[PDB]
Design a protein around this nucleic acid. Structure first.
Lengths: 148, 60, 125, 155, 85, 49, 116, 134
RNA sequence: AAACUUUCAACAACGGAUCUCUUGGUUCUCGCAUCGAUGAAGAACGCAGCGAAUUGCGAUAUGUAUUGUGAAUUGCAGAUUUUCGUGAAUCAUCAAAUCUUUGAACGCACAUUGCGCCCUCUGGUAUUCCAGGGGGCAUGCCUGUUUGAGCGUCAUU
């Protein structure tokens, strides 16, 4: 045991690891099933996008604060200002996130405009009868990217 | 002398013999064969000849 | 191949064939139909059946023809009248023949053979 | 969990592809790696995009016939034989060589048309992999390009 | 004579025919199968016994019912009958 | 034994009838390998229960 | 021998008589069986007995269904065997049944479609 | 406490595990009550329980149980969920309230070593995960 | 010199290597979610014209019904004409049934084909006895049910 100027490897195989080995041969074939299930959503959903429209948010910490990023959902401030309800925002595919709060006017404007551009770019199908479709754009994030 | 179904009492036989052949059974003696089927040995009363009723049923 | 609901696996195919049930086997025992008949019926090949009418085309028995007693779906063969080995004792045994050799020349007609033909895309009876 | 798939550097791979598409030119490289390309009127063999239209196999073979293959398509036909292995009983029962490779930019049935022809591996330029361009790691598969594809290599 | 002669004295039966697995492994001075732990309700079976799962699982036997569920699932638990074409 | 149980006699009744050889007409079946019966139990050689 | 569709028409008293006619012929056969090497007739006649018995039962059971049609609690054999799980698990009425709060909510806010 | 059964205290093994006595069954007393009534009242489905009383000898627990067979439940959607087959013996699996505490299932930093599930996170983080390309 | 021993040949043994095969495995991927008191899994004994095993099934026993297919099955024997047909088949399918004795196993037992009791019907002079046919009788818990129990406790003659 031990040896020549050779660095101290810490390796963790003293337990029965060879029972719990997981090799992702699937990887390549899983992808398929994801692509295929994303498509099956898109047909099932039909005109809508696969994704709900998500807001912009500044990542936490010293390390990442400089970066901006896509958060969970939109806040009952940013929605109310953009002129709708959280109850209804959900029906039009805006991610509402109750538990985020809003202490930066220069982030809200980023979002409020983002909601205003969304409510613009989408059309809503009347519930009553006619549904004049204009294809599906599959992602919101495609059409509404998080430019820093 | 019959082969009989297992799960068949000596009453059940007497009745079936009497019912099929319109015979008066004096007395049944069953047994169970090593092969694993019952075998009745049914006696008919004085009046009924076994010999004729044997060629009546079929087996001479 | 192109679809994903079909196998280039030999090992599976052979299993299927040798284990296939009579219902399937009937199909696998198609004989082609003659150069004469094909023009009449527009049908290259039918499943071979009990009434036979058949010119053997490959083997020692090629040229010779006949009717048939029985299709041996269990040996995938079709026994044929006249086409016989003779054992040393003088008794006559039927030769086995695989149908795709054998060529049908005077089909047996039935509602269900007509219907099959009409279903397969065949003019006339 | 033994290492089956082996990572390669994207860049190395490209290098190697490029370097295979070098070899697609130069007859010397192409003639060594099989290919009856003595009847052909010089290589970097591009063909019009009229072949790109082709629908049926009959017309695709008729293109190759007149272009300068057929010495290659006879190759892949005569060459077929049983494997010399147990691989016979693992779904590799027969072998046969690689014929040319029809690169193209666009598909209006080329893929379908060449499909059944026993040598011809079609392939997009978009992909154009070293598995198809330098098989057996023998540089210089005889590529039949299209006027579209061959234009698109610069891009 | 702990051997050939004391084997002589082997002429009884610790065990007999267990109801439940028809093994000759029904102890009697204990009233219970060593094999299948009848008359207790579960089958006396263990993980450590890898093979002796294999010797008695679903499929070792007939599966008079369960041979034919897969079908009934596949046809979607139909009821009634077919008619004609 | 003589003074036997019925669940015993029934299992012997099985094992008497089982012991009989391979009936010579299976030998002629198409796709048959069974030249002779393996499962065949002389009363001395091998016991039962 | 006997065809199902021919039995289906016959009455309950007719079938019992028919069954007895077969069970005699079966009996006379098994007497002839022991005096002859091969007796293959026996198989087809033993099917008939079944044919009949099946036809008898099938009529009986459709007739029981005929009485219990409508009312709750038909006999266990005349419910759908399905598979315990399903036969226990909530019926498409139940589960889809939604509390009155959640009904309202749905009506005011159903997932409206929307492009782009 | 739980007494480690072992004949006579003969634990056999590393003196660490010679401990027989001061030993504390990790499922509460609440749960054990819910569990014991579960097996008694097999048709019922435990829903929750609550403490009543105790003394020297015993804790006492009032256990509330619900009948998924019964219709008043099965129809009315407020309870109807409990009739699903993934609530058969919630008490045994530790899907009861006591169960989830005793499993150590809160959010946060004070509950890493169990959160999804103790034997889960372990079996996630005691796994060698190998890709195609390594 | 022969015999013998040894070596080596051809031919012959023994033996089953090698080669070639391959309805088996094998790992990998994908899809699905479906046992059981409506008796599961398992077992036992049976059942085929000629079966010992296997395969299938349960006294309707290598099957019945239904549907499809459209003439087989095939070792022999054998039918049956059903072969311009509501129809061959060790065919597929499968939604109707049968499903012996068991088995969680459930009347109580169970090294026993033991021992009951109840309802109903048919035999024997029969409400009670015997016998035969049918249908029952497990435990827990749950919701109700009726019948009750406790000066636990309220209000009345």
């Amino acid at each position: 045991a031990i040896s020549k100027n050779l660095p101290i490897l810490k390796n963790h195989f003293r337990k029965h690891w060879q029972e719990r080995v997981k090799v992702h041969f699937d990887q390549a074939g899983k992808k398929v099933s994801r692509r295929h299930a994303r498509a099956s959503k898109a047909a099932k959903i039909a005109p809508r996008p696969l994704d709900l429209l998500r807001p912009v948010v500044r990542a936490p910490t010293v390390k990442y604060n400089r970066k901006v990023r896509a958060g969970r959902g939109f806040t009952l401030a940013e929605i109310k200002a953009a002129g709708l309800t959280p109850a209804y925002a959900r029906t039009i595919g805006i991610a509402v996130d109750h538990r985020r709060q809003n202490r930066n006017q220069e982030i809200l404007d980023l979002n409020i405009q983002r909601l205003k551009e969304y409510q613009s770019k989408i059309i809503v199908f009347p519930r009553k009868g006619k549904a004049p479709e204009a294809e599906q754009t599959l992602s919101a994030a495609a059409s509404f990217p998080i430019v820093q | 002398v019959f082969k009989v179904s297992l799960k068949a009492n000596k009453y059940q036989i007497k009745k079936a013999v009497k019912e099929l052949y319109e015979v008066d059974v004096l007395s049944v003696n069953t047994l169970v064969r090593p092969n694993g089927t019952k075998k009745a040995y049914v006696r008919l009363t004085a009046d009924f000849d076994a010999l004729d009723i044997a060629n009546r049923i079929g087996y001479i | 191949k192109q679809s994903l609901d079909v196998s280039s696996d030999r090992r599976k195919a052979r299993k299927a064939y040798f284990t296939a049930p009579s219902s399937e086997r009937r199909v696998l025992l198609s004989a082609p139909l003659s150069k004469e008949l094909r023009e009449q019926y527009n049908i290259k090949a039918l499943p071979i059946r009990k009434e036979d009418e058949v010119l053997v085309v490959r083997g020692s028995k090629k040229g010779q023809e006949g009717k048939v007693s029985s299709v041996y779906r269990l040996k995938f063969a079709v026994q044929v009248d006249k086409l016989t080995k003779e054992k040393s004792n003088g008794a006559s045994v039927p030769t086995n023949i695989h149908p795709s050799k054998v060529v049908i020349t005077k089909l047996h007609l039935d509602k269900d053979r007509k219907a099959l033909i009409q279903r397969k895309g065949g003019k006339l009876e | 969990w033994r290492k089956w798939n082996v990572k390669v550097n994207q860049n190395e791979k490209r290098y190697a592809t490029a370097s295979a598409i070098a070899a697609s030119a130069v007859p010397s490289l192409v003639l060594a790696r099989g290919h009856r390309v003595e009847k052909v009127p010089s290589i970097p063999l591009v063909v019009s995009d009229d072949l790109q239209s082709i629908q049926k196999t009959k017309e695709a073979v008729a293109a190759l016939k007149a272009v300068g293959a057929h010495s290659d398509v006879i190759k892949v036909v005569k060459s077929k034989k049983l494997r010399a292995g147990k691989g016979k009983y693992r779904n590799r029962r027969f072998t046969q060589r690689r014929g040319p490779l029809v690169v193209y930019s666009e598909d209006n049935g080329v893929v379908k048309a060449f499909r059944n022809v026993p040598g011809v591996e079609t392939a997009n330029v978009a992909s154009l992999g070293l598995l198809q361009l330098a098989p057996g790691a023998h540089l210089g598969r005889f590529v039949i390009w299209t006027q579209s594809a061959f234009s698109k290599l610069d891009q | 004579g702990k051997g050939t002669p004391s084997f002589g004295k082997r002429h009884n039966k610790s065990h007999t025919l267990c109801k439940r697995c028809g093994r000759s492994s029904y102890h009697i001075q204990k009233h219970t199968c060593s094999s299948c732990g009848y008359p207790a309700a579960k089958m006396r079976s263990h993980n450590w016994a890898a093979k002796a799962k294999r010797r008695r699982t679903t499929g070792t036997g007939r599966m008079r019912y369960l041979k034919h569920v897969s079908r009934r699932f596949k046809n979607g638990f139909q009821s009634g009958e077919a008619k004609a074409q | 034994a003589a003074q036997k149980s019925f669940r015993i006699k029934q299992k012997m009744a099985k094992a008497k009838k089982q012991n009989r050889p391979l009936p010579q007409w299976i030998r002629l079946r198409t796709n048959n390998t069974i030249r002779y019966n393996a499962k065949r139990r002389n009363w001395r050689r091998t016991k039962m229960n | 021998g006997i065809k199902a569709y021919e039995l289906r028409t016959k009455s309950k008293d007719q079938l019992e008589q028919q069954l007895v006619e077969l069970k005699k012929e079966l009996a006379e056969l098994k007497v002839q069986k022991l005096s002859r090497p091969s007796l293959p007739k026996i198989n087809t006649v033993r099917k008939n007995i079944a044919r009949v018995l099946t036809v008898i039962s099938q009529n009986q059971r459709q007739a029981v269904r005929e009485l219990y049609k409508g009312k709750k609690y038909q006999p266990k054999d005349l419910r759908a065997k399905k598979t315990r799980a399903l036969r226990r698990a909530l019926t498409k009425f139940e589960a889809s049944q939604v509390t009155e709060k959640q009904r309202k909510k749905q009506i005011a806010f159903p997932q409206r479609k929307y492009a782009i | 406490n739980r007494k480690r059964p072992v004949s006579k205290g003969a634990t056999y093994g590393k003196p660490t595990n010679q401990g027989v006595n001061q030993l504390k069954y990790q499922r509460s007393l609440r749960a054990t009550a819910e569990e014991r009534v579960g097996r008694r009242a097999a048709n019922l489905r435990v829903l929750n329980s609550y403490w009543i009383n105790q003394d020297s000898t015993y804790k006492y627990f009032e256990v509330i149980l619900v009948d998924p067979s019964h219709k008043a439940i099965r129809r009315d959607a407020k309870y109807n969920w409990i009739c699903n087959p993934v609530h058969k013996h919630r008490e045994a699996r530790g899907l009861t309230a006591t169960g989830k505490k005793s499993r150590g299932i809160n959010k946060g930093h004070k509950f890493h070593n169990t959160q999804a599930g103790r034997r889960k996170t372990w079996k996630r983080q005691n796994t060698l995960s190998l890709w195609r390309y390594r």
